[PDB]
A paper describes a structure:
The TLP Gentlyase, the neutral metalloprotease from Paenibacillus polymyxa (EC 3.4.24.28), is an extracellular metalloprotease that cleaves fibronectin, collagen IV and, to a lesser extent, collagen and has maximum activity at neutral pH. This enzyme is used to gently disperse mammalian cells and tissues and is widely applied in cell-culture procedures or for the isolation and tissue dissociation of primary cells. The Gentlyase metalloprotease structure shows the overall architecture of a typical TLP.
Here, we report (i) a method that can be generally applied to identify suitable conditions to keep active TLP stable for crystallization and (ii) the structure of Gentlyase, the TLP of P. polymyxa, at 1.59 Å resolution in the absence of and at 1.76 Å resolution in the presence of phosphoramidon, the natural TLP inhibitor from Streptomyces tanashiensis. Sadly, the pair of Gentlyase structures described here do not help in clarifying the question of whether the domain movement upon inhibitor binding is a general feature of all Bacillus TLPs. The same rationale was applied to explain the lack of movement originally observed for thermolysin, in which the un­inhibited crystals also showed electron density for a dipeptide. In the uninhibited Gentlyase crystal the observed electron density for a dipeptide does not perfectly fit the side chains of any canonical amino acids. We used a Thr-Lys dipeptide model for refinement, which explains the electron density less poorly than Val-Lys. However, the observed electron density is likely to represent a mixture of proteolysis and autolysis products. The same Tyr150 position was observed as an alternative conformation in our structure of the uninhibited Gentlyase metalloprotease, indicating its possible physiological relevance. Another possible explanation for the lack of domain movement observed in the Gentlyase structure is the loss of the double glycine motif that precedes the central helix and is close to the thermolysin-like protease hinge-bending axis reported by Holland et al.. Comparison with other TLPs showed that the marked calcium dependency of Gentlyase stability may arise from a partly degenerated calcium site Ca1–2 and a deletion near site Ca3.
Author numbering: 1 to 304
The structure:
Amino acid sequence: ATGTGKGVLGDTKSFTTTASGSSYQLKDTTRGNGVVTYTASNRQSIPGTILTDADNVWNDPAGVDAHTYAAKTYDYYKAKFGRNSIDGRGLQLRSTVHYGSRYNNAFWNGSQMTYGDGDGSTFIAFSGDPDVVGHELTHGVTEYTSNLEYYGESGALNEAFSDVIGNDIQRKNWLVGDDIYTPNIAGDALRSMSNPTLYDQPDHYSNLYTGSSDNGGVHTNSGIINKAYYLLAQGGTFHGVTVNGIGRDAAVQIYYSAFTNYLTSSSDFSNARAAVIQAAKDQYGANSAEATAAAKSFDAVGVN
Ligand SMILES: [Ca+2]
Ligand SMILES: [Ca+2]
Ligand SMILES: [Ca+2]
Ligand SMILES: [Zn+2]
């Protein structure tokens, strides 16, 4: 069936649902093994209950966006990368919204995407930014490919790949989480990929966070890798190094191959530089403008 409804930002969209007895479930059986979206009813049991609606016009902005953006992310991976869901074999995509009460985060737990509502002040419902949905689902992609550990540089790479892909899905700007952060302030964000230090992330390896909090800085140090991706795609001169931009299309192919074919669970930033150079060589040639840009983007952020 074709359901309709407003997302967290008030925009009407359509998506696929399933008629089941007297009502419709928020369940799309046409993408892999399914896209299925649940409510946790403001408690913390997951997955919770499949969301239902009597007339297929939905009034659950968070669930509309969780469901729609998971279907769009499914379409994006298959269309862009030839990948069928998280495992490449059609894994069912399960999302739960209204997790907890005023809960200020969202996460991938090894099985499904779970989204808090936010407290209404700092955050609104987290599925409202397709780059956050993209971000969380890409944590499952990483689990099934490089399986990058979630500590230190490995864990920062894990984070950075989730931001590169989430951001690339929407393509609105160089920001992450901007649609759901601080609804009373325009143009800020959880992270910036073009200017990471705006939100207290380092943009160069010489300012790597080396403390133990946050699993050794995994949401901090991703700023360095996000900056390298930005320089590869957009180009720039940074720390004296000029990177000729190769555009998002080519950059995201290079990073996708790098992070799914070449990195492994213990990889650090140096290995990521090697993997990104290799993917650029695979795709454009050993001495191509693209392979040269890949190497310069890492020179620029001080990863040798
Ligand atoms: Ca209705
Ligand atoms: Ca966004
Ligand atoms: Ca804001
Ligand atoms: Zn993450």
